[PDB]
Design a protein around this ligand. Structure first.
Ligand SMILES: CCOC(=O)c1ccc(OCCC2CCN(c3ccc(C)nn3)CC2)cc1
Ligand SMILES: CCOC(=O)c1ccc(OCCC2CCN(c3ccc(C)nn3)CC2)cc1
Ligand SMILES: *C(=O)CCCCCCCCCCCCC
Ligand SMILES: *C(=O)CCCCCCCCCCCCC
Ligand SMILES: *C(=O)CCCCCCCCCCCCC
Lengths: 268, 235, 62, 5, 283, 283, 235, 60, 62, 62, 5, 5
C-alpha cells in the first residue's frame, strides 16, 4: 500500500497471542482451503461437540532446535507435537474424537552475511519408513510419536540389526523424504522456503485433511511438518556456524466428540 | 429370438475397453463424499507445479542431497558453463525424475512450453549477473557464452527478487516430441553462464548455491498412455 | 432413456457433428461404463497457494 | 425418449 | 465449464519490451510457481492451439485393467495324498507394483471398481489322460463370513456371499463393485495406528502395526474348481485385472522412487540409489 | 457436391466439323494433359451414362484387411532347456509387400487403423499328449515402455499399456487405433536424416540412416501364451491384418516397379528388368 | 437377457467387412490435419494424367530409356506401320505398366474411352504428316495404311503445336472389359503410319524420335478390386 | 442377422445378478395373496424390537 | 413399452439424474427380474403393538 | 442417435428408396466403421497444373 | 412408448 | 432421434 503496507510485514493474532514479522515471504494456505468447523451435511458423531475456541486455538511455541552444517533435517507430526500443549492437549485426551486445522509459523533469523535455505513442507498423511530390513510396518507408537521434541532426518539408511530386541523406530533418509520418494518433488506438497537472504520465516495455514470428517487424534496424525536444509548453512568463514529454528503452532477451528475419562498413553 | 451375427472382436478382453458389467453388490449403501481439500482433475496440473532439479549427478553427489545444489563462487569472469543440460524432459537423467519428468514417463508423446526458475541461495551481501540460455537443436551445443548468447536467453540480475524464470518456448518441427532420447525429436540445449561474476565483500562467504526448478506452461500436453520404466518387479 | 453424445472427430474420412449412443442396462451406477466427459480445473490450489493473490508482472516480494 | 447432449 | 478435451490456450503475438513490469523476476520462497508463458520473456507469433489434455484426465490415466494378482488352483486325482488346492487371496492393489504406483500419486481416492478374470489351465504330468471342461467358483468372503477350509465344505453354498461361476474357454469373467469403503474416501496412506497403547495396560495388548487400519480391510476371494477329482491332474491360474472406474483423487504426492518393500512406505537397504551418474556440464 | 458413386458424364451427340477450332492439336511440353472426349475427334451418338467411380475411391481401394506380419509363439514342456518363446514385433506396414505397394502410390496419408488378429496353433512332436485351450496376451509396448525379456516378467502386468487377451477358438480379435502420428500426416517417404553431422563433432556421432526418422517409430507388439508350460508342446501363430479406415492421401507417386529391397527405396542387382520383350510392330 | 439367435456368418472374419470395433487408445489427443497440397480423392484421377508408353520393348531396347523412343526417318513414303499395338490396357506389355495400366491391374473390369497423345521430338525444320489409327475388333489387324484408314483415325500434321491426340472411343459389346487378354472382351488395334513422309532440309538430322502418352477420358471407370501380379514376395 | 460383439462377462453366472429368464410353467393360475397379519418390509424393523441380552455367560 | 427409471448414484466420475432402461421380454411376471424399487414401513406392529398409543415423554404406566 | 442413409440399389428383386441404419456404439471416432459416403474431385491439379487456364479448342501454344 | 419413472 | 440422410 501507498501509505506503507507490505507482503513482508505481517501480524497474526489468535486468542491472547500475537506474532509480528518484518521479513516474511507472504503466507501459504494449503490447497487454498482455510480451516473450518464440521458442517451438518458432513457430520457423523451425533453428540454435541466440545469446541474450546480461545483456550486451545492460540499459539504454542515448541522447543527450539539448532541448525548447523551437520544438520540433515527435522520432522514433526500433528496433532502429536501439540499433545502436551495446555488445554488443547487436555481436550484431545478427554475425547475419543477430534479434528483440527493449524497455523504453522516457522522462525529462523540470521544476518545479511549468512546463507542457507530451509524447505518447510506440510505433508498430509506423512507415513515414514522404519529401520528394518527383516520386518515391515513395525515402528512402535512410542517411536512414531516423539511429541514436541520431533524427530530428525538422516543422510544414510542404517538398518536395525538387533533381531532379539528390535529398536522399532523410523530411519528417515533425507533425499528420499523418509518415505521412498525423491525430495525434489516434495514441492507438490504445501510449502514455503526460508531463504536467509529473503525471509526470517515460513507461515503455513493448514486445513483439517483426512478421508473422514473426524477421527481419533491419539491413534492418527493428519499432517507432518518436514523441515530440510535445501542449501546448507554458511557464515562468513566460520567452519562451525549455528542459528536457532523456533517452531510455533496454533490449532484452528478444533472440535471434539465422544467425551469420557482421560486417555493415558504408554509413551515410553 | 432376434437374429444376431457375431463380429470379430467377440469374447476378447481389451484392457482399455469401456463396457457395462453386472454389479456384485446390488443396493449397497454407498458412503457419500465429503469435501476433502486438494482434489486433482488432470495429471498436467501436477506438471505445472515447480519441482527441484538434481543438476549435479556426479559419482559422489548423485543420490545424496548434494545433487540438488549448483555451486557458484566469486571467481573472475569466465565464459565457461556453470551447467549444461539437454532438453529431454523424460529421458535426460537430471529431468527424468522430477514431477514433470515422472508424469511424462507414463506417456509416449509430449508437447508445449517449459519454464526453468533458478533460486539464489547466497547471502544478501552477494551480488551478480548470470545468463540463462536455450538453444534450439541443429547446431553445435554451446560451450561458451558467445554461442549461448545467440539463442533464447535471459540475463538475470541478482537482487531482492531472489529467483529468475526462463521460459523455454515450444519450438519443434513435429507436433509432439517423444519421451525417449531420439535425434528426430530432439529438444535442444539449456546452459547457464556468468554474465559478469558473483561479487562479495570481505567477511562474507565466497561460495554459494543456486537451486533450479522446472515446471510446465499452460500450453503443455501429453499423450499415448504407457508403462513407466521408473518402477519394476523382478520376481 | 437413450443418451446421445458428441464424438471429438480426429481423422476424418473423405466423406456436421458425429454422435454415439449409450443405454444403461443396470440399476446400480457402479455397473456403468466410464463417461469420459470430464472436467478440467485451474492448478491454483497447488501452483499459487499464497494468501495474497500474485500479479505476474509485479515484484513477487514487496 | 432420447436424452441428447 | 472447461472440458478435459478442450483445446489449450492460443499463443498470442507479442512484441518488444522496455518496461518496469518484471515477469521474469520472482521469489519461490513464497510457495508459488511463477505463471509464465513464452510471450512474457520472448517475442512470439500468433498460434491457434489445437492440443488437448483429454488423455491425462484422472479417468484416462487410470482407464486400463491392471494385473493385481495371480491365483493358483488345481483338481488332482482322487487317490492323491495331497489336498485339492483351492485359492484364498486377501484383496488389495498392493501385491503388484504398477497400478499401486499410479494410485500412490495421490493420498486419497474414490472409485467404482471393475474386476476382470482371465483363467488359464494346463496339464502337469507327462501322463496321457484327459480332463473334461472345468467350471470355476470365485466366491467373495467379506470380513466376518466363514472362510473355506476345504474345497468342498458348506461355505461354498454362497447363500449370501457373491459368487461367480466361470466356464473354461468362455469370454473372461467380469463384475463391477461399488465404492465399498467405511470412510468417505480410500486412504492410500494412513499415518497412524489402530490401537492406543495405554499405560495401565500391558505392552503386548496395546501393540499394533504402523500404518495399518482395519486388520481385515476388505475380505478375500476364494477360488476353486467345482469339478470332482479327475485321474489326470490339471492345474489352473486365475489372473485378476482391476480397473478403477468413475474415479476421483485428492492430495498429490511424489511417485515411488525406490523399490517397494512390503505394504507400507518402507525401503530396503541396497535399493536406495535410483539416479545415474551425469556430469553438471555434460549435455 | 459430386459423390463417388455418382454416374459419370453422358456422351453427347456430335456431328461433322469443318472449323478453325483444333482440339486434337496440343503441346504436352506445358505440363498439361489434353482434356479430350470422343466427340472432339469422332462423330458420336447420345449415350446416357450409368457407370460410377465408387469402387476406385481412396476408401474403397484400401477397404480390405491386409496381412502385415506373422508372429510365432509357443508353450513348451517345463523340463525343456530352451526358453518359452514369446514374440516381439516392431510395428510396420513394410514387412510384407502388397499393402505397402498400395499405400506407396501416395507420398503422405492419414488414417484410423483397424487391426484384426487370426490365431492358429498346432502340435510339434509325434507325441500323444494334450493341451487345454490356450489364452494369448497381445500387449502393445509404446516407445519408452519396458520391453519384455521373459514370457512371465513384470511387464506383462500392463497397468498402462493396452493389452488384448485372446481365447483360442473364439472369433478373431479386433481393435481400432486412432491416427497416432507426431506429424500432421504419415510420411510414406522421408528424403532426409534424423541427425546433422557437425564438423566439430566426430563422424561416428553425426551418423544416421538415410530415410529413417524416429528410430523407434511406433513401438512393438509383444505376444505370449498365458498358459503355463504343458508336457506336450504347442506352437502357435498370430497373423496380423491391417485395414486403413477413414483414410486420406496426398501427392501421387508411380508404383513400385521392381522388387522391394528392405525398408527404403533401394533396389537389388538382378531384380531391375521387369518388362518383357515385345516388338514395335507386333500387336 | 434379450432372446437372440445366431445366424450363419457368426464369428467369421471377412477381410472386406465394415464393422465397429473397440479403440485401444481412448481419449488420445489426435494431431489435426494441415492443408497439404496434392490430395487425391479417387484412383481414376491418376489414370487421367498422361503417362509415357514403353513402345519399343525389343530385346535390346526393353528396360532401358530406349524403350520409350519411337524412331522415325525422312525415308520415302511407305504404307507399312511405324508401330502396332493391341488395345489391352492392363495386359499388353506396352500399356500394362503405364500409370493407367498399373491402376487397372488392381481391378478386374475396365470401361470408358482412352486417349493417345504423340509428341514430335524432331527439329523445327522437320515437317511431316502421320496417320494415327484405331480399328475396333473383329477383322484382320491392319498391316497397311489402306486398312487402317478405314477405321477411327486422325491425320496429324506436324508444325508449331508439337503434339497430337487421338481419342479411342468406348466401342464394346460388353458393358465392361476384363483386365486380362481375353478374346471375348478384346479391345481392337492401334497403329501409326506415315501419311506423306518426314521431310528435312540439308544440315538437319534425318532421324528423330516421337514419344507417346496414354491417359483415360472422363467417362472411364474400373471395378472389382483385386490383387496385382506386378509385385510379389517369394519367401 | 444384427452384428453383435460379445463383451467380457459373457456366459458367466454371477449369483447376485438380476436378469429375466424363461418361465417353466406358462399361464399357471396363481393363487392370490390374502392379508396375513405381520408383514415385514425390511430386516431393520426386526432389529428395532427389544430382545433380551444373555449377560451372564459364565461357565455354569 | 420401455421402462425408464433413476439410479441412486453413489461414486460419481469427474464428469443431472442418471437413468437405466428396462424391457420385459416375456408374458409371465415370474420371468421378470427384480425391480428393487421397494417400500419401507414403520415398525409399530412389532415395536409398539399396544392398544393404547404410547407417548414417549409420558409415564408408560399410569 | 440413429443414422439413416440410402443404398444405391443395383439388382432389384421382382418386388421407392431402400435405406439402411447405423448406430455408433463407441465414444472414439476411430472405432467407427467406414461411411463410404465419399466425395469426388476434379483432376485439374494433376492434369492441368498450368498457370494460364487452357481452352481445349484453342492452340495450346500461342 | 417410453414409460418414465 | 433418427438423423435421416
Ligand atoms: C488401503 C488399501 O487398499 C485399498 O484402498 C483398496 C484395495 C482394494 C479395493 O477394492 C475394494 C475391496 C473389494 C470389494 C468387493 N470385491 C468383490 C466383490 C464381489 C466379488 C464376487 N468379488 N470381489 C473385491 C474388492 C479398494 C481399495
Ligand atoms: C513410416 C512408416 O510406417 C507408417 O507410416 C505406419 C506404420 C504403422 C502404422 O500404425 C501405427 C502404429 C501403431 C499404433 C498403435 N498400435 C496398437 C495399439 C494398441 C494395441 C493393443 N495394438 N496395437 C498398433 C500400430 C501407421 C503408419
Ligand atoms: C430409453 O431408453 C427409451 C428407449 C429404449 C430403446 C430400446 C433400448 C434397447 C434395449 C434395452 C433393453 C433393456 C436393457 C436392460
Ligand atoms: C415398448 O417397448 C416400445 C419400444 C420397443 C423398443 C424395442 C425393444 C427391443 C427389442 C425387444 C424385442 C421383444 C423382446 C421379446
Ligand atoms: C439415437 O441413437 C436414439 C435411439 C437409440 C435406439 C436404440 C439403439 C440400440 C441400442 C444401442 C445401445 C447403445 C450402444 C452403446
Amino acid at each position: 500500500e501507498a501509505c506503507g503496507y507490505s507482503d513482508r510485514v505481517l501480524q497474526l493474532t489468535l486468542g491472547n497471542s500475537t506474532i509480528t514479522t518484518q521479513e516474511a515471504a507472504n503466507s501459504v494456505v494449503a490447497y487454498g482451503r482455510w480451516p473450518e468447523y464440521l458442517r451438518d451435511s458432513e457430520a457423523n458423531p451425533v453428540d454435541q461437540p466440545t469446541e474450546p475456541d480461545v483456550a486451545a486455538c492460540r499459539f504454542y511455541t515448541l522447543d527450539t532446535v539448532s541448525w548447523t552444517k551437520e544438520s540433515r533435517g527435522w520432522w514433526w507430526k500433528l496433532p502429536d507435537a501439540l499433545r502436551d500443549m495446555g488445554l488443547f492437549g487436555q481436550n484431545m485426551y478427554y475425547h475419543y474424537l477430534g479434528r483440527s486445522g493449524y497455523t504453522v509459523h516457522v522462525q529462523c533469523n540470521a544476518s545479511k552475511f549468512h546463507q542457507g535455505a530451509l524447505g518447510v513442507f506440510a505433508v498430509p498423511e506423512m507415513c515414514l519408513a522404519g529401520d528394518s530390513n527383516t520386518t515391515t510396518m513395525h515402528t512402535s507408537y512410542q517411536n512414531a510419536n516423539p511429541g514436541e521434541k520431533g524427530g530428525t532426518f538422516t543422510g544414510t539408511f542404517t538398518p536395525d540389526n538387533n533381531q532379539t530386541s528390535p529398536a522399532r523406530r523410523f530411519c528417515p533418509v533425507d533425499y528420499l523424504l523418509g518415505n521412498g520418494t525423491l525430495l525434489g518433488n516434495a514441492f507438490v506438497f504445501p510449502h514455503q522456503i526460508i531463504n536467509l537472504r529473503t525471509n526470517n520465516c515460513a507461515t503455513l495455514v493448514l486445513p483439517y485433511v483426512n478421508s473422514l470428517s473426524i477421527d481419533s487424534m491419539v491413534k492418527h496424525n493428519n499432517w507432518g511438518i518436514a523441515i530440510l536444509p535445501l542449501a546448507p548453512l554458511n557464515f562468513a568463514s566460520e567452519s562451525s556456524p549455528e542459528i536457532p529454528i523456533t517452531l510455533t503452532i496454533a490449532p484452528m477451528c478444533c472440535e471434539f466428540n465422544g467425551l469420557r475419562n482421560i486417555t493415558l498413553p504408554r509413551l515410553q | 429370438g432376434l437374429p444376431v451375427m457375431n463380429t470379430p472382436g467377440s469374447n476378447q478382453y481389451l484392457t482399455a475397453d469401456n463396457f457395462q458389467s453386472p454389479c456384485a453388490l446390488p443396493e449397497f449403501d454407498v458412503t457419500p463424499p465429503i469435501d476433502i481439500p486438494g482434489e486433482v482433475k488432470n495429471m498436467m496440473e501436477l506438471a505445472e507445479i515447480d519441482t527441484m532439479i538434481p543438476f549435479d549427478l556426479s559419482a559422489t553427489k548423485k543420490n545424496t542431497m548434494e545433487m540438488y545444489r549448483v555451486r557458484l563462487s566469486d571467481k573472475p569472469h569466465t565464459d565457461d558453463p556453470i551447467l549444461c543440460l539437454s532438453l529431454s524432459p523424460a529421458s535426460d537423467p537430471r529431468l527424468s525424475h522430477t514431477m514433470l519428468g515422472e508424469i511424462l514417463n507414463y506417456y509416449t508423446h509430449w508437447a508445449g512450453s517449459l519454464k526453468f526458475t533458478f533460486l539464489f541461495c547466497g547471502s544478501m551481501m552477494a551480488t551478480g549477473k548470470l545468463l540463462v540460455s536455450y538453444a534450439p537443436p541443429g547446431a553445435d551445443p554451446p560451450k561458451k557464452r558467445k554461442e549461448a548468447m545467440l539463442g533464447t536467453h535471459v540475463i538475470w540480475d541478482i537482487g531482492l527478487q531472489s529467483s529468475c524464470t526462463m521460459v523455454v518456448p515450444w519450438i519443434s518441427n513435429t507436433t509432439y516430441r517423444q519421451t525417449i532420447d531420439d535425434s528426430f525429436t530432439e529438444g535442444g540445449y539449456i546452459s547457464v553462464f556468468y554474465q559478469t561474476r558473483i561479487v562479495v565483500p570481505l567477511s562474507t562467504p565466497r561460495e554459494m548455491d543456486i537451486l533450479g526448478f522446472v515446471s510446465a506452461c499452460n500450453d503443455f500436453s501429453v499423450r499415448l498412455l504407457r508403462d513407466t520404466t521408473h518402477i519394476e518387479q523382478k520376481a | 432413456g437413450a443418451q446421445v453424445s458428441s464424438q471429438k472427430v480426429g481423422a476424418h474420412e473423405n466423406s456436421s457433428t458425429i454422435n454415439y449412443t449409450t443405454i444403461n442396462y443396470y440399476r446400480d451406477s457402479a455397473s456403468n461404463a466410464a463417461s469420459k466427459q470430464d472436467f478440467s480445473q485451474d492448478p491454483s490450489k497447488f501452483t499459487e497457494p499464497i494468501k495474497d493473490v500474485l500479479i505476474k508482472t509485479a515484484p513477487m516480494l514487496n | 425418449g432420447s436424452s441428447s447432449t | 465449464a472447461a472440458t478435459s478435451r478442450d483445446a489449450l490456450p492460443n499463443t498470442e503475438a507479442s512484441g518488444p519490451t522496455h518496461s518496469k513490469e518484471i515477469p521474469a523476476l520472482t521469489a519461490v520462497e513464497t510457495g508459488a510457481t511463477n505463471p509464465l508463458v513464452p510471450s512474457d520473456t520472448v517475442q512470439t507469433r500468433h498460434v491457434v492451439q489445437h492440443r488437448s489434455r483429454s488423455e491425462s484426465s484422472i479417468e484416462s490415466f487410470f482407464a486400463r485393467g491392471a494385473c493385481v494378482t495371480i491365483m493358483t488352483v488345481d483338481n488332482p486325482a482322487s487317490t492323491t495324498n495331497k489336498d485339492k488346492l483351492f485359492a484364498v487371496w486377501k484383496i488389495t492393489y498392493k501385491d503388484t507394483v504398477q497400478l499401486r504406483r499410479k494410485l500412490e500419486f495421490f493420498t486419497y481416492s474414490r472409485f467404482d471398481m471393475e474386476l476382470t478374470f482371465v483363467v488359464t489351465a494346463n496339464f502337469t504330468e507327462t501322463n496321457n489322460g484327459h480332463a473334461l471342461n472345468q467350471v470355476y467358483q470365485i466366491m467373495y468372503v467379506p470380513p466376518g463370513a466363514p472362510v473355506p477350509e476345504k474345497w468342498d465344505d458348506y461355505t461354498w453354498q454362497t447363500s449370501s456371499n457373491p459368487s461367480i461361476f466361470y466356464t473354461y474357454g468362455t469370454a473372461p469373467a467380469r463384475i463391477s463393485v461399488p465404492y465399498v469403503g467405511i470412510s468417505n474416501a480410500y486412504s492410500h496412506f494412513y499415518d497412524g495406528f489402530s490401537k492406543v497403547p495405554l499405560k495401565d495396560q500391558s505392552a503386548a495388548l496395546g501393540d499394533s502395526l504402523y500404518g495399518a487400519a482395519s486388520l481385515n480391510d476388505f475380505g478375500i476371494l476364494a477360488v476353486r474348481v467345482v469339478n470332482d477329482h479327475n485321474p489326470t491332474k490339471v492345474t489352473s491360474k486365475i489372473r485378476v485385472y482391476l480397473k478403477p472406474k468413475h474415479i476421483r483423487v485428492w492430495c498429490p504426492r511424489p511417485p515411488r522412487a525406490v523399490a517397494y518393500y512390503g505394504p507400507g512406505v518402507d525401503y530396503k537397504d541396497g535399493t536406495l540409489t535410483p539416479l545415474s551418474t551425469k556430469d553438471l556440464t555434460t549435455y
